[PDB]
Chains A and B, each alone.
Chain A
Amino acid sequence: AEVTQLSNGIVVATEHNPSAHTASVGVVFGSGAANENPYNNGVSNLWKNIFLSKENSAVAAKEGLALSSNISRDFQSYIVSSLPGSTDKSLDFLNQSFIQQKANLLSSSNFEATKKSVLKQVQDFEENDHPNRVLEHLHSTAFQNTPLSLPTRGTLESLENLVVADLESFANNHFLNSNAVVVGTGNIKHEDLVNSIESKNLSLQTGTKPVLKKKAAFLGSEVRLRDDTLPKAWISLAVEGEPVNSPNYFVAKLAAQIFGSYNAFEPASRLQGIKLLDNIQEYQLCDNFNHFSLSYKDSGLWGFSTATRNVTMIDDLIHFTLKQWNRLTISVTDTEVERAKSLLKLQLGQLYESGNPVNDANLLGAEVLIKGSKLSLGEAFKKIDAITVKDVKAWAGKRLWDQDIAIAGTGQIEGLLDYMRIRSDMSMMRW
């Protein structure tokens, strides 16, 4: 495989997979949820859903073109998938959708129907999807009074104040030339995409997205959304992780991989090679957990989210999990590092080299927006092979051993104790 890249003010980056049967072509902007003030919050979600609106999707589906979109903290994307003989049709449709006009998408009826639909979706997310809203409050309290705290989904109190003028103001300030990368993944060649872009004009705008006054800074805090009428207790807990373009990126991900993920109901998940499972399976402390190493442009998060029904033994869950985290600084073995190497090679090659072209388009767009070129997977495997136990211990002493944490929880979290015992459990007192 190979990733090429060229420039004319726009950036054209591709992945010619000749074995695939489709071809995704779309623009990936460099603005995201982290580029909004807290009063126009959710305008990226509303651009996602006016791009995926019914009239626009119908006009797309007349030619056999499926639309896709994604709103992250750092990057938006607007991807159009088609057969590999219709890349010109997809480019001309994306041109007509964004560049040539926006007033037909931003009519009164389409905007009011879409605002109604996104208000319904945000309310449905707020009162029914519990582990994701725990993770969103974890971001909202780890990075508070700072633009990386804003949720990608938007809030009900802000999103019902947006009108068309704010949509157009965000479009003029963020849908720009240098801010964007046009991405073609799947079964298209790079030269075909560049010659077809130069065949059209496709000039988005003059350029220069506004620069944020405040950089992201981690802030140890907690938020407790206690709802006694829920059957479980969802809780995330994280420290300041590593951002992208850091030398400790793959080390932070391998540290997340050491303790892995778990599902107490699957039989092959209870037999993993984690030493936390011997403590966690005896009295059935949780139903599931997953360790995440989230990496953003300015900062990052490293921690775990979990859910449990054993609501009287939440503190034992947090206790054994954090003592296992303290094992990284002091006495992590060689076999755990080798196992995490093999599993992280596995899940990283599943992530970057799955068969779905829209996910490849999102990942390639994000990576060539942030760091200018895509690191191919072989050099990634060499960087994973270069990690030793001393690198993990040095990273854990830098980032894990007695550092501030951020906690978010909802449900029956009365069994979760104060902030100070969870904070003081980050250092063992025995080392």
Chain B
Amino acid sequence: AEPEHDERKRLGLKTVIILSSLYLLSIWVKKFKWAGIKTRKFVFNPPKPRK
């Protein structure tokens, strides 16, 4: 029923290793390129009401 079984499991090993490494690398790059926006700060002194 499953003549592909051997090659299916070794290609599964390759694919799971490469995609786990890509997933962790992409988590790093998302935390990297969002670092300017996570740490952004806002202060607010309310303006002069005469205008």
A287–chain B nearest beta-carbon distance, Å? 24
Q: Which residues of B contact A127 (CB under 8 A)?
A: 48
Q: Which residues of A contact B51 (CB under 8 A)?
A: 229
- Is the pair A420, B33 in contact by a Cβ cutoff of 8 Å? yes
Docked pose: A127 CA to B47 CA in angstroms: 10
Q: Which residues of A contact B49 (CB under 8 A)?
A: none
By beta carbon, the residue of chain A nearest B45 is A157
Docked pose: A127 CA to B36 CA in angstroms: 28
By beta carbon, the residue of chain B nearest A127 is B48
Q: How large is the interface on B (under 10, 10 to 19, 20 to 34, 35 or more residues)?
A: under 10
B32–chain A nearest beta-carbon distance, Å? 10
Q: Which residues of A contact B48 (CB under 8 A)?
A: 127
| Interface residues as binary, A406-427 with B (CB distance below 8 Å gives 1, 0 otherwise) | 0000000000001110000000
By beta carbon, the residue of chain A nearest B33 is A420
The answer to whether B1 has its CB under 8 Å from any CB of chain A is no
The answer to whether B18 has its CB under 8 Å from any CB of chain A is no
A430–chain B nearest beta-carbon distance, Å? 20
The answer to whether B37 has its CB under 8 Å from any CB of chain A is yes
Docked pose: A418 CA to B37 CA in angstroms: 9
By beta carbon, the residue of chain A nearest B48 is A127
B residues within 8 Å of A by Cβ?
33, 36-37, 48, 51
A-B contact pairs, 7 of them (CB 8 A): A127-B48, A229-B51, A418-B36, A418-B37, A419-B36, A420-B33, A420-B36
By beta carbon, the residue of chain A nearest B34 is A420
Q: Which residues of A contact B33 (CB under 8 A)?
A: 420
Docked pose: A132 CA to B26 CA in angstroms: 42
B2–chain A nearest beta-carbon distance, Å? 47
A223–chain B nearest beta-carbon distance, Å? 10
Q: By CB atoms of chain A within 10 A, which of B36, B37, B48, B51 has the most?
A: B36
By beta carbon, the residue of chain B nearest A123 is B48
Docked pose: A237 CA to B44 CA in angstroms: 23
Q: Which residues of B contact A420 (CB under 8 A)?
A: 33, 36
Docked pose: A234 CA to B39 CA in angstroms: 25
- 5 closest pairs, A vs B, by CB? A419-B36, A420-B36, A420-B33, A418-B36, A229-B51
B39–chain A nearest beta-carbon distance, Å? 10
B30–chain A nearest beta-carbon distance, Å? 12
Docked pose: A127 CA to B51 CA in angstroms: 11
Docked pose: A229 CA to B48 CA in angstroms: 13
Q: Tell me the residues in window 258-295 of chain A with beta carbons closer than 8 Å to chain B beta carbons.
A: none
By beta carbon, the residue of chain B nearest A157 is B45
Q: Tell me the residues in window 392-412 of chain A with beta carbons closer than 8 Å to chain B beta carbons.
A: none
Q: Which residues of A contact B37 (CB under 8 A)?
A: 418
B25–chain A nearest beta-carbon distance, Å? 18
Q: Tell me the residues in window 202-239 of chain A with beta carbons closer than 8 Å to chain B beta carbons.
A: 229
Docked pose: A419 CA to B36 CA in angstroms: 7
Docked pose: A418 CA to B33 CA in angstroms: 11
Docked pose: A229 CA to B50 CA in angstroms: 13
Q: Tell me the residues in window 88-130 of chain A with beta carbons closer than 8 Å to chain B beta carbons.
A: 127
Docked pose: A396 CA to B42 CA in angstroms: 34
A221–chain B nearest beta-carbon distance, Å? 9
Docked pose: A425 CA to B48 CA in angstroms: 37
Q: Which residues of B contact A229 (CB under 8 A)?
A: 51
By beta carbon, the residue of chain A nearest B37 is A418
Docked pose: A229 CA to B47 CA in angstroms: 12
Docked pose: A233 CA to B51 CA in angstroms: 19
